[PDB]
Amino acid sequence: VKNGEKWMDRYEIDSLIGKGSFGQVVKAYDRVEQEWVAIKIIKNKKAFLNQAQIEVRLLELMNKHDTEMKYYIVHLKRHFMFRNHLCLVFEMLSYNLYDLLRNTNFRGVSLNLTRKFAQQMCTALLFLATPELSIIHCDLKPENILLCNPKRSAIKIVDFGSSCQLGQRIYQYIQSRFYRSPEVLLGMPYDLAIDMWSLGCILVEMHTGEPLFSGANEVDQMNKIVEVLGIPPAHILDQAPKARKFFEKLPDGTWNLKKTKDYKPPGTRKLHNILGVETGGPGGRRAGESGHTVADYLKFKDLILRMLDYDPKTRIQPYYALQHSFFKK
Numbered sequence: 507v508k509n510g511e512k513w514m515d516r517y518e519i520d521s522l523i524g525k526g527s528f529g530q531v532v533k534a535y536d537r538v539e540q541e542w543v544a545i546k547i548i549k550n551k552k553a554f555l556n557q558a559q560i561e562v563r564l565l566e567l568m569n570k571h572d573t574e575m576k577y578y579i580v581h582l583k584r585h586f587m588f589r590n591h592l593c594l595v596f597e598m599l600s601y602n603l604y605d606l607l608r609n610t611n612f613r614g615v616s617l618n619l620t621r622k623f624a625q626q627m628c629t630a631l632l633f634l635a636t637p638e639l640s641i642i643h644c645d646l647k648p649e650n651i652l653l654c655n656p657k658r659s660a661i662k663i664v665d666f667g668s669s670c671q672l673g674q675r676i677y678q679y680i681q682s683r684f685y686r687s688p689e690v691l692l693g694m695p696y697d698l699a700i701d702m703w704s705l706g707c708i709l710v711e712m713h714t715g716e717p718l719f720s721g722a723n724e725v726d727q728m729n730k731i732v733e734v735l736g737i738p739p740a741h742i743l744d745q746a747p748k749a750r751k752f753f754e755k756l757p758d759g760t761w762n763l764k765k766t767k768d769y770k771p772p773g774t775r776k777l778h779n780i781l782g783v784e785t786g787g788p789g790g791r792r793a794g795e796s797g798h799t800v801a802d803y804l805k806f807k808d809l810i811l812r813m814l815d816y817d818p819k820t821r822i823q824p825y826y827a828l829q830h831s832f833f834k835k
């Protein structure tokens with residue numbers, strides 16, 4: 507697709523904004539509404555088309571529920587078929603939270619800005635947890651959270667390409683590795699709690715600048731999690747189909763790691779130190795900055811650890827996250 511190209515007496519293609527496995531996204535001028543739009547053009551291949559059809563049904567499903575909380579999700583304006591490609595038309599948005607991290611030279615944004623992102627994302631998750639919706643994003647990460655305007659801190663989630671309703675799971679290998687939940691790593695059946703896990707991983711990374719758990723593969727990933735959170739509870743591992751990819755069961759001291767050729771011991775890389783709760787924030791770089799008091803850090807550490815609960819049934823849901831002391835006055 508070239509700049510200038512006109513479609514159906516209606517769309518004037520300008521440029522490529524984004525590319526994907528799914529196809530590509532372009533900045534186009536809508537001649538009818540008299541405004542710029544983002545067009546997500548799916549490749550004319552069964553695989554992407556079928557997955558894109560599910561994205562469109564889930565977005566259309568969301569647009570049917572007018573309430574406060576639906577406005578944290580990219581608005582699908584319309585979709586249509588053209589030159590044998592499915593095309594999704596969305597409102598134009600700005601750069602994503604990865605680029606934002608890139609721009610801070612991976613030094614991270616303030617606890618104050620992290621909080622504003624956190625509250626918006628928790629609100630999105632509460633909206634998707636609507637019983638008649640019950641949508642699991644399955645690919646929450648900085649790159650899939652966009653700024654609404656480059657001047658401002660308003661954010662919106664994008665890419666429902668992997669999304670599925672509760673009990674419409676297709677693939678068991680889902681989520682970006684860095685943001686993959688234990689349950690999905692362990693090959694267990696997954697609910698909306700995996701997005702909360704991802705959100706935990708994301709918020710820490712927005713403030714520190716570096717991923718919380720940057721596994722180079724699933725075995726690596728699980729060890730970097732164990733470094734911070736220790737061994738997962740017996741009852742979770744007893745039920746896990748891929749427990750034995752990572753751990754070994756014995757009679758006494760039921761569960762332990764499968765050591766390879768050599769990370770820190772289980773639960774020793776304390777989140778306390780990762781955050782720099784008592785040491786002036788990440789790399790001490792927040793020493794004496796306001797809204798970076800130890801009281802402020804500890805509230806965040808609590809909320810994050812509630813988000814990184816190993817147990818998805820006791821892991822903090824979105825409603826109770828919004829009512830946390832981290833979001834008070």
Ligand SMILES: Cn1cnc2ccc(-c3cc(N)nc(N)c3)cc21
Binds near residue numbers: 524580597599664667
């Ligand atoms: C880069 N960019 C600017 N405005 C946008 C609006 C939407 C999208 C977009 C939405 C969905 N559902 N999936 C992908 N992969 C991209 C990207 C945008």
Ligand SMILES: [Cl-]
Binds near residue numbers: 648
């Ligand atoms: Cl990333």
Ligand SMILES: [Cl-]
Binds near residue numbers: 645
């Ligand atoms: Cl995925």
